[PDB]
Ligand binder design. Sequence first.
Ligand SMILES: [Mg+2]
Length: 167
Amino acid sequence: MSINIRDPLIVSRVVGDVLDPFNRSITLKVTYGQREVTNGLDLRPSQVQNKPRVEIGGEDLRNFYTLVMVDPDVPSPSNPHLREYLHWLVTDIPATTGTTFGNEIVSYENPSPTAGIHRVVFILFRQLGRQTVYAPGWRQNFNTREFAEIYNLGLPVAAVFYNSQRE
Ligand SMILES: [Mg+2]
């Protein structure tokens, strides 16, 4: 068939629940301690207690990127009425650098799921310009599609997710 049925972002419903279809075009590497996040990797809450290191690609150093980190499975995947929970929001990340050079306008909150296996999703967007993104007023019931529309973030240029569950 011509339709992709195997991409982990499709199989997990990250594309669907959270994201529209998009083309990966910028590298994104998220590392918790020594562990690089790969799609569907299981990480325990102790492993993600502190913010990860985030390195991004890009070829035009003039460009700025926003990183969104959300849990769509809140409070549980079977009753996700708080979808999405915003764990982290970092803006103005210069191309080819990472979140430490960006503005962490919603601080990292470490995941601590207490009901089921939760997807924890990192999404990178190219900004229209520096300083164009503002914070939401709340972390629960966040909506990445709506936020991206409001702040002219277009479609993702990269995304990856891990799975986490209570120990
Ligand atoms: Mg809700």
